Amino acid sequence: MFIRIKCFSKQPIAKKVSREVSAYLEYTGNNTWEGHISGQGVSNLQTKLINVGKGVKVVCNYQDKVLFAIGNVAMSDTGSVPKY
Amino acid sequence: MFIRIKCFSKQPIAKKVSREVSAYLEYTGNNTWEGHISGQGVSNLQTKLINVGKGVKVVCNYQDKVLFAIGNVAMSDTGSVPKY
């Protein structure tokens, strides 16, 4: 199943999340890991990120529905988060 | 018809392409625009990306497969644009 991972965390923890998810999917560009994993696959993925610890800001996408999200990221309203 | 734009351009071309395509999609962060848009709307979109000019580096993704891409980029088997 088609999974796009967006990491909004902060270095050097951002490189640690890049280490785990880059061991699972390819690096498409600018902290975005596109690929495909299954339900058991994302189960091992999320238990590895819960073994990572605090400060991890991960939003997964299966198509458009958000499958899971770790961290205190205020994804306001329906689909996006700009700031300025 | 849910498509996503990734832009690897340089300022001030990057700010200009953000202005022209952020009027059509919703800004996610780290130069990524996922959103819902029509196919002939993609036709006028790629027309106005032609009218941005040279120096723009924009890739359009429908699911995984690339519908359209503008500007001198090297992609590969997993679509990874190296890492750094």
Binding site: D64, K65, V66, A74, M75, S76, D77, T78, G79, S80, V81, P82, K83, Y84 | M1, F2, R19, S22, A23, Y24, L25, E26, Y27, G35, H36, I37, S38, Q40, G41, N44, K48
Partner: protein, 289 residues
């Protein structure tokens, strides 16, 4: 200078709650009390509905009106709105509409057509679950609506018949989705919150289909004592009970918040292009002649 994206291929719809809507750098957006802008894709935006504590400025209203994004004010009930009027409408649609509409029999014919397309809305749009295509109660209830609107003796005979329908259908889905909530504007539970945040999507899709193809709202097809607001209610019942109600009961039972509700409704609207769909179905009424 590009053809300005005709209304049938605009895709983004929103309700704005507890915000400030303006223009930042040629981009329409809204702000929370910590900034956090949410730049509105005005080339694809249908509408912006505004809840309490909200406002929109003139330059934003003009920039959304040049492409024609309809702005309304949510506080069933009286909803106030602003239709873009500088852009000159295609004449033949509302010309044929008013020529039929001042005749009372053709007014009845137009009203029975637009209210009978709710069955077409329920049969064309199909990616549901739970009750799904029928629970042996909702098919009978659209059948009884078909009977009531095929009756159609007078305009005030069914003046609040859809009010009884939103009552009976908010109780009818609730016997399989376990809560005993009722139709109320101030009930603090999640079910009435979801079904009060839902009718404004019907209002907005109805409004921006009423913006360039045909009719300005105050020439309506449902008037009476309790039907206050005009034609926008009449063309909003099409996706009231067919679309937002099953996803509302889904989101209220499986228990997430407002945001993923609006995520699911935006997905449902974009999967079938219901803006485009009800554009070309109100084209069948304005361009019948």
């Amino acid at each position: 200078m590009q053809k300005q994206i005709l209304t049938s291929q605009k895709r983004n719809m929103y309700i704005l709650s507890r915000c400030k809507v303006l223009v930042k750098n040629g981009q329409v957006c809204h702000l929370h009390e910590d900034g956090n802008v949410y730049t509105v894709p005005y080339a694809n935006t249908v509408f912006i509905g505004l809840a309490e504590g909200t406002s929109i400025t003139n330059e934003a209203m003009s920039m959304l009106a040049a492409n024609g994004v309809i702005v309304f004010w949510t506080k069933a009930a009286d909803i106030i709105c602003h239709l873009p009027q500088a852009d000159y409408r295609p004449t033949k649609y509302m010309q044929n509409w008013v020529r039929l509409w001042l005749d009372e029999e053709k007014k009845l014919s137009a009203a029975k057509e637009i209210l009978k397309m709710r069955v077409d809305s329920l049969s064309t749009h199909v990616h549901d679950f739970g009750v799904d295509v029928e629970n042996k109660r909702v098919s009978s209830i659209v059948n009884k609506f078909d009977k009531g609107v095929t009756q159609a003796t007078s305009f005030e005979s069914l003046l609040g018949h859809e009010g009884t329908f939103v009552k009976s259908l908010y109780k009818e889905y609730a016997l399989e989705y376990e809560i005993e909530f009722k139709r109320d504007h101030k009930s603090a539970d999640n079910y009435n919150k979801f079904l009060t945040l839902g009718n404004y999507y019907a209002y907005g899709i109805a409004r921006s289909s009423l913006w360039a193809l045909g009719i300005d709202n105050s020439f309506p097809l449902l008037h009476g004592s309790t039907r206050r607001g005009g034609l926008v209610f009449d063309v909003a019942d099409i996706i009231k009970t067919s679309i937002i109600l099953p996803l509302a009961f889904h989101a209220a039972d499986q228990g997430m918040s407002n945001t993923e509700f609006k995520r699911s409704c935006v997905a449902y609207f974009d999967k079938n292009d219901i803006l485009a769909y009800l554009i070309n179905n109100i084209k069948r009424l304005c361009m019948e002649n």
